[PDB]
Coordinates of C-alpha atoms in Angstrom, one line a residue:
Chain A
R1 CA -46.4 50.2 -46.9
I2 CA -45.1 48.9 -43.2
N3 CA -45.8 50.2 -40.3
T4 CA -42.4 50.9 -38.1
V5 CA -42.5 53.1 -34.5
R6 CA -40.8 56.0 -36.2
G7 CA -43.7 55.6 -38.9
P8 CA -44.4 53.5 -42.5
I9 CA -42.1 53.3 -44.8
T10 CA -42.3 50.9 -47.7
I11 CA -41.7 47.5 -48.6
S12 CA -38.5 48.7 -51.0
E13 CA -36.8 50.5 -47.8
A14 CA -36.9 47.5 -45.2
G15 CA -34.1 45.3 -46.3
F16 CA -32.7 42.3 -44.9
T17 CA -34.6 42.1 -41.8
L18 CA -34.4 39.6 -39.0
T19 CA -37.9 38.4 -37.6
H20 CA -39.4 37.5 -34.0
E21 CA -37.0 39.0 -31.9
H22 CA -37.8 41.3 -28.6
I23 CA -35.2 43.7 -28.4
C24 CA -36.4 45.0 -25.0
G25 CA -38.6 43.9 -22.3
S26 CA -37.3 40.6 -20.7
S27 CA -38.3 42.6 -17.1
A28 CA -41.9 42.4 -18.5
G29 CA -42.5 45.9 -16.5
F30 CA -40.3 45.1 -13.6
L31 CA -37.1 47.7 -14.4
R32 CA -40.3 50.3 -13.8
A33 CA -40.5 49.1 -10.1
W34 CA -36.5 47.6 -9.5
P35 CA -35.0 49.8 -12.2
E36 CA -32.0 48.5 -9.4
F37 CA -32.0 45.2 -9.9
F38 CA -32.5 45.5 -13.9
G39 CA -31.3 48.5 -14.7
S40 CA -32.2 52.2 -15.7
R41 CA -34.4 52.1 -19.2
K42 CA -31.3 54.6 -20.4
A43 CA -28.5 52.2 -19.4
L44 CA -31.2 49.0 -21.7
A45 CA -32.0 51.3 -24.1
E46 CA -28.0 52.0 -24.4
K47 CA -27.9 48.3 -24.5
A48 CA -29.7 47.6 -27.5
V49 CA -28.2 50.5 -29.3
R50 CA -25.4 49.1 -29.3
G51 CA -26.1 46.1 -31.0
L52 CA -28.6 47.6 -33.0
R53 CA -25.6 49.4 -34.5
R54 CA -23.9 46.0 -34.4
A55 CA -26.3 43.9 -36.5
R56 CA -26.9 47.4 -39.1
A57 CA -23.0 47.4 -39.9
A58 CA -23.3 44.2 -40.7
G59 CA -26.4 44.8 -43.1
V60 CA -29.3 44.5 -41.1
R61 CA -31.7 47.0 -41.7
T62 CA -34.8 46.1 -40.1
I63 CA -35.8 44.8 -37.5
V64 CA -39.7 42.9 -36.4
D65 CA -39.6 42.7 -32.1
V66 CA -42.8 40.0 -31.3
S67 CA -43.3 41.4 -27.9
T68 CA -46.8 41.8 -26.8
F69 CA -47.9 43.5 -23.9
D70 CA -47.9 41.1 -21.8
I71 CA -44.4 40.5 -21.6
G72 CA -43.2 44.2 -21.0
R73 CA -43.6 45.5 -24.6
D74 CA -42.4 49.0 -24.7
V75 CA -43.4 50.8 -28.0
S76 CA -41.4 53.8 -26.6
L77 CA -38.3 52.4 -26.0
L78 CA -38.4 51.4 -29.5
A79 CA -38.9 54.1 -31.0
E80 CA -36.2 56.1 -29.5
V81 CA -33.7 53.0 -29.6
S82 CA -34.8 52.9 -33.7
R83 CA -33.8 56.6 -34.1
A84 CA -30.8 56.6 -32.6
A85 CA -29.9 53.3 -34.5
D86 CA -31.4 54.2 -37.3
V87 CA -32.8 51.0 -37.8
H88 CA -36.4 50.4 -38.6
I89 CA -38.7 48.6 -36.2
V90 CA -41.7 47.1 -37.2
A91 CA -43.8 46.1 -33.3
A92 CA -46.5 43.5 -32.7
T93 CA -49.9 43.6 -31.3
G94 CA -51.3 40.0 -30.1
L95 CA -50.9 37.7 -27.0
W96 CA -48.8 35.5 -25.3
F97 CA -49.3 32.1 -23.6
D98 CA -51.3 32.4 -19.9
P99 CA -52.4 36.0 -20.8
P100 CA -54.4 37.7 -17.8
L101 CA -57.7 36.8 -16.8
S102 CA -58.8 40.6 -17.6
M103 CA -57.8 39.1 -21.7
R104 CA -58.3 35.5 -20.7
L105 CA -62.2 36.5 -20.6
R106 CA -62.5 38.1 -23.1
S107 CA -64.6 36.7 -26.1
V108 CA -63.5 36.4 -30.1
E109 CA -65.6 40.0 -30.9
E110 CA -63.2 41.7 -27.9
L111 CA -60.2 40.8 -28.9
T112 CA -60.2 41.2 -32.7
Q113 CA -61.7 44.7 -31.8
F114 CA -58.3 45.4 -29.2
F115 CA -55.5 43.4 -32.0
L116 CA -58.0 46.4 -33.9
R117 CA -57.0 49.2 -31.8
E118 CA -52.9 48.3 -31.4
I119 CA -52.8 48.4 -35.4
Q120 CA -55.6 50.9 -36.4
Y121 CA -55.4 53.9 -33.7
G122 CA -51.9 53.0 -31.7
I123 CA -50.3 51.3 -28.9
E124 CA -51.5 52.6 -25.8
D125 CA -51.0 56.9 -26.1
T126 CA -48.6 57.1 -28.4
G127 CA -50.3 57.0 -31.4
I128 CA -47.2 54.5 -32.6
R129 CA -48.9 51.2 -34.7
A130 CA -48.3 48.1 -35.1
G131 CA -47.1 45.8 -37.8
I132 CA -47.4 42.5 -37.4
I133 CA -50.3 40.4 -35.1
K134 CA -48.3 38.0 -32.3
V135 CA -50.2 34.5 -31.3
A136 CA -48.2 32.3 -28.2
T137 CA -49.4 29.1 -27.3
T138 CA -48.0 26.3 -24.9
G139 CA -48.4 23.3 -25.0
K140 CA -52.3 21.3 -24.2
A141 CA -55.0 22.8 -27.1
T142 CA -57.5 25.4 -25.0
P143 CA -59.9 26.6 -26.5
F144 CA -58.8 30.0 -25.5
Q145 CA -56.2 29.6 -28.2
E146 CA -58.8 29.0 -30.3
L147 CA -60.2 32.2 -30.2
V148 CA -57.0 34.0 -30.2
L149 CA -56.5 32.5 -32.4
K150 CA -59.7 32.9 -34.4
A151 CA -59.2 37.0 -33.1
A152 CA -56.5 37.4 -34.5
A153 CA -58.1 35.6 -38.2
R154 CA -60.2 38.9 -38.9
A155 CA -57.8 41.3 -37.4
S156 CA -55.7 40.1 -40.7
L157 CA -58.5 39.9 -42.7
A158 CA -60.0 43.6 -41.9
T159 CA -56.6 45.2 -42.4
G160 CA -54.4 42.9 -44.1
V161 CA -51.4 42.4 -41.2
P162 CA -49.2 38.9 -40.8
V163 CA -50.2 36.5 -37.7
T164 CA -47.5 35.0 -36.4
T165 CA -47.6 32.1 -34.0
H166 CA -46.3 29.5 -32.0
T167 CA -47.5 25.9 -32.3
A168 CA -48.5 23.8 -29.3
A169 CA -47.3 20.4 -27.6
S170 CA -49.9 18.8 -29.4
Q171 CA -49.5 16.9 -32.7
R172 CA -49.4 18.3 -36.3
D173 CA -50.5 21.0 -34.6
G174 CA -50.2 23.5 -36.5
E175 CA -52.6 21.2 -39.3
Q176 CA -55.3 22.2 -36.7
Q177 CA -54.8 26.5 -37.0
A178 CA -54.8 26.2 -40.6
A179 CA -57.8 24.7 -39.7
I180 CA -58.6 27.5 -37.7
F181 CA -57.5 30.1 -40.0
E182 CA -58.3 28.7 -42.9
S183 CA -62.7 28.2 -42.0
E184 CA -61.8 32.1 -41.0
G185 CA -60.8 32.8 -44.7
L186 CA -57.8 33.8 -43.7
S187 CA -54.8 33.5 -47.1
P188 CA -52.5 31.3 -45.4
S189 CA -49.7 34.0 -47.2
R190 CA -51.2 35.7 -44.5
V191 CA -50.0 33.1 -41.6
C192 CA -46.9 31.9 -40.7
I193 CA -46.8 28.8 -38.3
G194 CA -44.0 28.8 -35.9
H195 CA -41.6 26.1 -35.1
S196 CA -39.2 25.5 -31.4
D197 CA -37.3 22.7 -33.4
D198 CA -36.1 20.6 -36.2
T199 CA -37.9 17.7 -34.5
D200 CA -40.4 17.6 -36.8
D201 CA -41.9 15.5 -39.3
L202 CA -40.6 16.6 -42.9
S203 CA -43.5 15.9 -44.6
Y204 CA -45.6 17.4 -42.1
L205 CA -43.8 20.7 -43.0
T206 CA -44.2 20.4 -46.2
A207 CA -47.4 19.7 -46.1
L208 CA -48.2 22.6 -44.1
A209 CA -45.8 24.7 -46.9
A210 CA -47.7 23.1 -49.7
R211 CA -50.7 25.1 -48.2
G212 CA -49.5 28.0 -48.8
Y213 CA -48.7 28.9 -45.2
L214 CA -45.2 29.8 -43.7
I215 CA -42.7 27.8 -41.7
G216 CA -41.5 29.5 -39.0
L217 CA -38.6 28.0 -37.4
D218 CA -38.5 30.9 -35.2
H219 CA -38.8 30.4 -31.5
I220 CA -37.8 29.1 -28.6
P221 CA -40.8 29.0 -25.5
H222 CA -40.4 31.1 -22.5
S223 CA -39.0 28.2 -19.8
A224 CA -38.0 28.3 -16.3
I225 CA -35.7 24.7 -17.1
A226 CA -32.2 16.7 -23.0
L227 CA -34.1 13.5 -23.9
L228 CA -33.2 14.4 -27.8
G229 CA -30.1 15.1 -26.1
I230 CA -28.4 18.7 -27.4
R231 CA -28.1 19.6 -31.2
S232 CA -26.3 22.1 -32.9
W233 CA -26.8 25.2 -34.8
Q234 CA -25.8 23.8 -37.7
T235 CA -27.8 21.2 -38.0
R236 CA -30.8 23.2 -37.2
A237 CA -29.1 25.0 -40.2
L238 CA -29.6 21.7 -41.9
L239 CA -33.1 22.3 -42.0
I240 CA -33.5 25.3 -43.9
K241 CA -31.5 23.5 -46.7
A242 CA -34.0 20.5 -46.8
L243 CA -37.1 23.0 -47.0
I244 CA -35.1 24.9 -49.9
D245 CA -33.9 21.9 -51.7
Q246 CA -37.7 20.4 -51.1
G247 CA -38.5 23.6 -52.9
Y248 CA -39.8 25.6 -50.5
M249 CA -37.6 28.2 -50.1
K250 CA -40.3 30.4 -50.4
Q251 CA -42.0 30.1 -47.4
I252 CA -39.7 30.9 -44.7
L253 CA -39.0 32.1 -41.8
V254 CA -36.0 32.2 -39.2
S255 CA -35.0 33.8 -36.1
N256 CA -31.7 33.7 -34.8
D257 CA -33.1 32.8 -31.3
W258 CA -34.6 29.2 -33.3
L259 CA -30.9 29.2 -35.2
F260 CA -29.1 29.4 -31.2
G261 CA -31.0 26.9 -29.9
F262 CA -31.9 29.2 -27.0
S263 CA -34.2 32.2 -25.9
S264 CA -32.4 35.5 -25.7
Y265 CA -35.9 37.1 -23.6
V266 CA -34.8 34.2 -21.1
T267 CA -31.8 35.0 -21.4
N268 CA -31.6 38.5 -20.1
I269 CA -32.9 37.9 -16.8
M270 CA -30.6 34.6 -16.6
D271 CA -27.7 34.1 -13.7
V272 CA -25.9 32.6 -16.8
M273 CA -23.7 34.6 -18.8
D274 CA -22.7 30.8 -20.3
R275 CA -26.1 31.0 -22.6
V276 CA -25.1 34.4 -24.6
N277 CA -25.0 34.2 -27.7
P278 CA -21.6 35.9 -28.3
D279 CA -22.7 38.0 -32.1
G280 CA -26.1 38.9 -31.0
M281 CA -28.5 39.5 -32.8
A282 CA -25.6 39.3 -36.4
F283 CA -25.2 35.7 -35.3
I284 CA -27.3 34.7 -38.3
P285 CA -25.7 37.5 -40.8
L286 CA -22.5 37.1 -39.4
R287 CA -22.5 33.1 -39.3
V288 CA -25.7 31.8 -40.2
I289 CA -25.4 32.9 -44.5
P290 CA -21.6 32.0 -44.3
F291 CA -22.5 28.0 -43.4
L292 CA -25.3 27.5 -45.7
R293 CA -23.2 29.4 -48.5
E294 CA -20.8 27.2 -47.7
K295 CA -23.4 24.0 -47.8
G296 CA -23.8 24.7 -51.6
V297 CA -27.1 27.2 -51.0
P298 CA -27.2 30.5 -53.6
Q299 CA -26.5 33.8 -52.5
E300 CA -30.3 34.6 -54.9
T301 CA -32.4 32.1 -52.7
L302 CA -30.2 33.3 -48.8
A303 CA -30.9 36.4 -49.9
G304 CA -34.6 35.6 -50.9
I305 CA -35.6 34.5 -47.4
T306 CA -34.1 37.1 -45.7
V307 CA -35.1 40.5 -48.0
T308 CA -38.8 38.6 -50.0
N309 CA -39.7 36.3 -47.3
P310 CA -40.6 39.1 -44.8
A311 CA -41.3 42.0 -46.6
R312 CA -43.8 39.6 -48.5
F313 CA -44.9 38.5 -45.3
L314 CA -44.8 42.1 -43.8
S315 CA -46.7 44.3 -46.9
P316 CA -50.6 44.5 -45.8
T317 CA -51.9 42.1 -48.3
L318 CA -55.9 41.3 -48.9
Chain B
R1 CA -46.1 53.7 12.9
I2 CA -47.8 52.1 9.9
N3 CA -47.1 52.9 6.0
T4 CA -50.3 54.2 4.6
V5 CA -49.9 55.6 0.5
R6 CA -50.1 59.1 2.3
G7 CA -47.4 58.3 5.3
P8 CA -47.7 57.0 8.2
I9 CA -50.4 56.8 10.7
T10 CA -50.9 55.9 14.0
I11 CA -51.9 52.8 15.2
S12 CA -54.8 54.3 16.9
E13 CA -55.8 56.4 13.6
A14 CA -56.6 52.9 11.8
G15 CA -59.6 52.2 13.2
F16 CA -61.4 49.6 11.9
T17 CA -59.4 47.9 9.1
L18 CA -61.2 45.8 6.3
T19 CA -57.8 43.9 5.2
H20 CA -57.0 41.9 1.6
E21 CA -59.0 43.8 -0.7
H22 CA -58.0 44.9 -4.3
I23 CA -59.3 47.9 -4.6
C24 CA -58.2 48.5 -8.0
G25 CA -56.1 47.1 -11.6
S26 CA -58.6 43.9 -12.1
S27 CA -57.4 45.0 -15.6
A28 CA -53.7 43.3 -14.8
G29 CA -52.8 47.4 -17.0
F30 CA -54.4 46.8 -19.6
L31 CA -56.5 49.9 -18.9
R32 CA -53.5 51.7 -20.6
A33 CA -53.4 49.4 -23.6
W34 CA -57.0 49.0 -23.9
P35 CA -59.3 51.9 -21.5
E36 CA -62.0 51.9 -24.7
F37 CA -62.7 48.5 -22.8
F38 CA -61.2 48.5 -19.4
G39 CA -62.5 52.3 -19.2
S40 CA -60.1 55.2 -17.8
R41 CA -58.2 55.7 -15.4
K42 CA -60.6 58.4 -14.2
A43 CA -64.0 57.0 -14.1
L44 CA -62.6 54.0 -12.3
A45 CA -61.0 55.9 -10.3
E46 CA -64.4 57.6 -9.4
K47 CA -66.3 54.2 -9.2
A48 CA -63.4 53.4 -6.4
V49 CA -64.1 56.7 -4.6
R50 CA -68.0 56.0 -4.9
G51 CA -67.0 52.3 -3.1
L52 CA -65.0 53.6 -0.1
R53 CA -67.4 56.3 0.7
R54 CA -70.2 54.2 1.1
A55 CA -68.4 52.3 3.3
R56 CA -66.6 55.0 5.2
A57 CA -70.2 55.9 5.8
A58 CA -70.6 52.1 7.1
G59 CA -67.3 52.4 9.1
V60 CA -64.6 51.5 7.7
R61 CA -62.1 53.9 8.5
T62 CA -59.0 52.0 6.7
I63 CA -57.7 49.7 3.7
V64 CA -55.9 47.0 3.1
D65 CA -55.4 46.6 0.1
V66 CA -53.3 43.6 -1.8
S67 CA -52.5 43.9 -4.6
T68 CA -48.9 43.2 -6.2
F69 CA -46.9 44.8 -8.9
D70 CA -47.1 42.1 -10.9
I71 CA -51.4 41.9 -11.4
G72 CA -51.0 45.8 -11.6
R73 CA -51.1 47.0 -8.6
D74 CA -50.8 51.2 -9.6
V75 CA -50.7 53.0 -6.6
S76 CA -50.9 57.0 -7.4
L77 CA -54.3 55.7 -8.2
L78 CA -54.4 54.6 -4.7
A79 CA -52.8 57.8 -2.8
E80 CA -55.4 59.8 -5.0
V81 CA -58.7 57.6 -4.2
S82 CA -57.2 58.0 -0.6
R83 CA -57.4 61.3 -0.9
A84 CA -60.1 62.0 -1.9
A85 CA -62.4 59.5 -0.1
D86 CA -60.7 59.9 3.1
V87 CA -60.0 56.8 3.9
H88 CA -56.5 55.3 4.5
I89 CA -54.6 53.1 2.2
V90 CA -52.1 50.5 3.0
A91 CA -50.5 48.9 0.4
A92 CA -48.4 46.0 -0.6
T93 CA -45.0 44.8 -1.5
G94 CA -44.6 41.0 -2.3
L95 CA -45.9 38.8 -5.7
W96 CA -48.4 36.5 -6.7
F97 CA -48.4 33.0 -7.8
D98 CA -46.7 32.1 -11.4
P99 CA -44.9 35.6 -11.8
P100 CA -43.1 36.2 -14.2
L101 CA -39.4 35.1 -15.6
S102 CA -37.9 37.8 -14.1
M103 CA -38.8 37.7 -10.7
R104 CA -39.5 34.0 -10.9
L105 CA -36.1 33.3 -11.8
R106 CA -34.5 35.5 -8.7
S107 CA -32.1 33.7 -5.9
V108 CA -33.8 34.3 -1.7
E109 CA -31.5 36.9 -1.8
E110 CA -32.6 39.1 -4.6
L111 CA -36.1 38.9 -3.5
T112 CA -35.3 40.6 -0.3
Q113 CA -33.7 43.1 -1.6
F114 CA -36.8 43.7 -4.3
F115 CA -39.5 43.8 -0.9
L116 CA -37.4 45.6 0.9
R117 CA -37.2 48.5 -1.9
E118 CA -40.6 48.5 -1.5
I119 CA -40.4 49.0 2.1
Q120 CA -38.1 51.5 2.4
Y121 CA -37.4 53.2 -1.4
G122 CA -40.5 53.1 -2.0
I123 CA -42.4 52.1 -4.5
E124 CA -41.6 52.9 -8.4
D125 CA -40.5 56.2 -8.3
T126 CA -43.7 57.0 -6.2
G127 CA -42.3 57.7 -2.6
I128 CA -44.8 55.6 -1.2
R129 CA -43.8 52.9 1.1
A130 CA -45.5 49.7 1.3
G131 CA -47.4 48.7 4.6
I132 CA -47.6 44.3 4.0
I133 CA -45.9 41.6 2.2
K134 CA -48.1 39.4 0.5
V135 CA -46.9 35.9 -1.3
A136 CA -50.3 34.0 -3.2
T137 CA -49.3 30.6 -4.5
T138 CA -50.9 28.1 -5.5
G139 CA -51.8 24.5 -6.2
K140 CA -48.8 22.1 -5.5
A141 CA -45.4 22.7 -3.8
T142 CA -43.3 24.3 -5.9
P143 CA -39.4 24.7 -4.5
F144 CA -39.7 27.8 -5.7
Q145 CA -42.6 28.8 -3.2
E146 CA -40.6 28.4 -0.6
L147 CA -37.5 31.1 -2.1
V148 CA -40.6 33.5 -2.4
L149 CA -41.6 32.1 1.9
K150 CA -38.1 33.0 2.9
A151 CA -37.1 36.1 1.5
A152 CA -40.3 37.0 2.5
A153 CA -39.7 36.3 6.6
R154 CA -36.0 38.0 5.7
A155 CA -37.7 41.2 5.1
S156 CA -40.9 41.2 7.8
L157 CA -37.8 40.3 10.1
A158 CA -35.7 43.5 9.1
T159 CA -38.4 45.6 8.8
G160 CA -40.8 44.4 11.1
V161 CA -43.5 44.8 8.5
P162 CA -46.1 42.1 8.2
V163 CA -46.6 39.1 6.2
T164 CA -50.1 38.0 4.1
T165 CA -50.3 34.3 2.8
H166 CA -52.4 31.9 0.0
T167 CA -52.1 28.5 1.4
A168 CA -51.7 26.0 -1.8
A169 CA -53.3 23.3 -2.7
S170 CA -51.3 21.0 -0.7
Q171 CA -52.9 18.9 2.8
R172 CA -52.6 21.0 6.0
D173 CA -50.0 23.5 3.6
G174 CA -49.7 25.4 6.0
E175 CA -48.5 24.0 8.6
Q176 CA -45.3 23.6 5.6
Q177 CA -45.3 27.5 5.3
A178 CA -44.9 27.5 9.5
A179 CA -42.2 25.6 9.5
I180 CA -40.5 28.2 7.0
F181 CA -41.3 31.0 9.1
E182 CA -40.1 29.1 11.8
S183 CA -37.0 28.4 10.6
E184 CA -36.6 31.8 9.3
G185 CA -36.4 33.1 13.2
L186 CA -40.0 34.7 12.6
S187 CA -42.2 35.4 15.3
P188 CA -45.5 33.8 14.4
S189 CA -47.7 36.7 15.4
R190 CA -46.2 38.5 12.0
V191 CA -48.2 36.3 9.4
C192 CA -51.2 35.1 8.0
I193 CA -52.0 31.9 7.0
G194 CA -54.7 33.1 4.5
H195 CA -57.6 29.8 3.8
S196 CA -59.7 30.0 0.8
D197 CA -62.6 28.2 1.8
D198 CA -63.9 26.6 4.9
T199 CA -63.5 22.8 4.3
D200 CA -60.2 22.8 6.8
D201 CA -60.1 21.0 9.1
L202 CA -60.5 23.1 12.4
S203 CA -58.3 21.2 14.3
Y204 CA -56.0 22.2 11.8
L205 CA -57.4 25.0 12.3
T206 CA -56.9 25.8 15.4
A207 CA -53.5 24.5 16.1
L208 CA -52.1 27.3 14.0
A209 CA -53.6 29.0 16.1
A210 CA -52.5 27.9 18.4
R211 CA -48.8 28.3 17.8
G212 CA -49.4 32.1 17.3
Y213 CA -50.1 32.7 13.5
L214 CA -52.6 34.6 12.8
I215 CA -55.5 33.1 10.7
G216 CA -57.1 34.1 7.4
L217 CA -59.7 33.7 6.0
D218 CA -59.4 36.1 3.8
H219 CA -59.6 35.2 -0.1
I220 CA -61.1 34.0 -3.1
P221 CA -58.3 32.1 -5.3
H222 CA -58.5 33.7 -9.6
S223 CA -58.9 31.7 -11.8
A224 CA -61.2 31.5 -15.2
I225 CA -63.5 28.3 -13.3
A226 CA -68.8 22.5 -7.0
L227 CA -68.6 18.8 -5.6
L228 CA -68.5 20.8 -2.0
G229 CA -72.1 21.9 -3.0
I230 CA -72.5 25.9 -3.2
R231 CA -72.0 27.3 0.5
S232 CA -74.0 30.8 2.1
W233 CA -72.2 33.4 3.2
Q234 CA -74.2 32.3 6.2
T235 CA -72.2 28.8 6.8
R236 CA -69.1 31.0 6.0
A237 CA -70.2 33.0 8.9
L238 CA -70.2 30.5 11.8
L239 CA -66.9 29.0 10.9
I240 CA -65.7 33.5 12.8
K241 CA -67.8 31.6 15.3
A242 CA -66.7 28.7 16.2
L243 CA -62.9 30.2 16.0
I244 CA -63.9 32.4 18.3
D245 CA -65.8 30.0 20.7
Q246 CA -62.5 27.8 20.7
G247 CA -61.1 30.9 22.3
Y248 CA -58.7 32.1 19.3
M249 CA -60.9 35.6 18.1
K250 CA -57.3 37.5 18.4
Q251 CA -56.2 35.5 16.0
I252 CA -58.4 35.5 13.3
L253 CA -58.8 37.4 10.2
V254 CA -61.4 37.9 7.4
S255 CA -62.0 39.5 4.2
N256 CA -65.1 40.4 2.5
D257 CA -64.8 38.4 -0.4
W258 CA -63.5 35.0 1.9
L259 CA -66.3 35.5 3.2
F260 CA -69.4 36.3 0.1
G261 CA -67.2 33.9 -1.9
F262 CA -66.3 35.4 -5.0
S263 CA -63.1 36.9 -5.9
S264 CA -64.5 40.5 -6.7
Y265 CA -61.1 41.3 -8.0
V266 CA -62.3 38.3 -11.3
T267 CA -65.9 39.9 -10.7
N268 CA -65.1 43.5 -12.1
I269 CA -63.3 41.3 -15.1
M270 CA -66.4 39.2 -15.6
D271 CA -69.1 39.8 -18.6
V272 CA -71.8 38.3 -15.0
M273 CA -73.0 40.8 -12.3
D274 CA -74.9 37.9 -11.1
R275 CA -71.5 37.1 -9.8
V276 CA -71.5 40.4 -8.3
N277 CA -72.1 41.9 -3.7
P278 CA -74.4 44.9 -3.9
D279 CA -73.0 45.9 -0.6
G280 CA -69.2 46.4 -1.9
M281 CA -66.9 46.2 0.6
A282 CA -69.6 47.5 3.4
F283 CA -70.6 44.0 2.9
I284 CA -69.0 43.3 6.6
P285 CA -70.4 45.6 8.6
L286 CA -73.4 46.0 6.8
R287 CA -74.2 42.4 6.8
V288 CA -72.3 40.5 8.5
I289 CA -71.5 41.7 11.8
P290 CA -75.4 41.9 12.8
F291 CA -75.2 37.9 11.8
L292 CA -73.1 37.0 14.0
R293 CA -73.9 39.4 17.0
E294 CA -78.0 37.6 16.1
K295 CA -75.5 34.6 16.8
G296 CA -74.9 35.4 20.0
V297 CA -71.0 37.0 19.3
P298 CA -70.2 39.7 21.9
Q299 CA -69.5 43.3 20.2
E300 CA -66.3 43.8 21.7
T301 CA -65.8 40.6 19.8
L302 CA -66.8 41.3 17.0
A303 CA -64.8 45.1 17.6
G304 CA -61.4 43.3 18.3
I305 CA -61.6 41.4 15.1
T306 CA -62.0 43.7 12.9
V307 CA -59.6 47.1 14.6
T308 CA -57.1 45.1 17.5
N309 CA -56.4 42.0 15.1
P310 CA -55.9 44.0 12.2
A311 CA -53.6 46.7 13.7
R312 CA -51.9 44.8 16.0
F313 CA -50.8 43.6 12.8
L314 CA -49.7 45.8 10.7
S315 CA -48.5 47.2 13.8
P316 CA -44.3 46.3 12.7
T317 CA -42.5 44.6 15.2
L318 CA -39.5 43.5 16.4

């Protein structure tokens, strides 16, 4: 049983699942303070439903939202949009990078309790419970990172809920994360190590996958912001293929954003519509799957990645 | 007329005013998500009232809270505490350093409108209006800083509400701020340039004061965090005296925190009670004024700084 914003559902109910999305919250709470600019909570919910419905028509049935409290997560809006669009939504607990001092000053022990709260008791006063633990980490490696990583490993160990991370600026930063999880006794299959691009060494990726970790090609870091020039999503899609070819199809998780090349979250607060993904959340099913199929990847394999992988991952396993 | 959290009041009503305080909000909104750790909104309001009442007994009548939306400002809690303690509270508009991308990506024009909203229309859906514009700026000088400074100069020019800033890591960073205000046509008497310590060159301070700016010895930067060793508040108090001696008593604004040497805001989320100011907000009236009096400073002068200076500053002047 997986916790959704409308309650627990069974694994078989999940179906085709999109991971690492940000359905709402791009204002980071500023829409309450400046609805005139940001828009009203209702108009936002409308925008969302419209998008969900298109995705759903495309075949999507569940979505994993990874917004945390510190970046504007609003579970009640999520519950509302979920009901109206008839698409399951899993919400997250965790922290983003550079969290407020209030949390930044907390110990491993306190942090573990806050995450447990959001999962076992519910978020805020909503009675809505989290179904995943999100850990965003930026650039240079800090002690704080370690702590957060450890509190997340413990919350997972206690509950069986999965952990999804963002790897820092360090090299093979993921090996360093693996080490933390492992030293906490957390099974690697409970963890998704996320990456922002296709620049990592395949040898590095495969090795991690060989250890049991899930490999996420899952996010675009939130930034204001060339060397590498600019790759196409087609080229990034190819990485999936390689991993698959290497024998790792069971360990992959991929998001619309990582493929497209831009953070959807940021796009919404930007002036530029040039940055927009005309397919929205339907990008994977509408374009990416077809492309991979055209490259020779079998249907069933693609299905393993968009249905099986997510399900197994979300399913609380102790 | 000055806008308070309970409405407009006249200048003569203000009386003895404490500036640059953070009455609540140290959790940055996390108390909604984790009341078990942070405490309930009621217990917090209780803690606050108790403090206000002590200050009031000491002679304080008004307090300027400089929390902005991005760091947990809660005007409704402020309105409640104000009524219960019978102490006027002025709330702020503005932004802290490192604001979210949502605001970080806004133009001078948009930013001016948001500040105008908070002053002319009200904060959130409270109908409560801001009476000061706060601009916190950290270390290295950015273009973003410039922008925020300019939007604040325009909001002030339109409304007559004052601007209070935090000077960055740059040298004589305040000269650079002055330049911005001046190029916006804002009268210097509408601006308070804040400083975190007593390390600045007196020649630098006096020059700014000579131009008409208010000098704030007003804050302690929010940080996780020696060279300079550790000065006493008595030594910092002496700076006030020098400025006074130089002829600048009409241009000074000073806060409890700057004197004490620690950010009260941070202290509340820390583990260490060792960092606490046993006098709370009554520190200035209970200890600092007596000390200055003992150093020879005249009563009336001290009164000019804690009553007159604040009033004139808050009073919307175009």
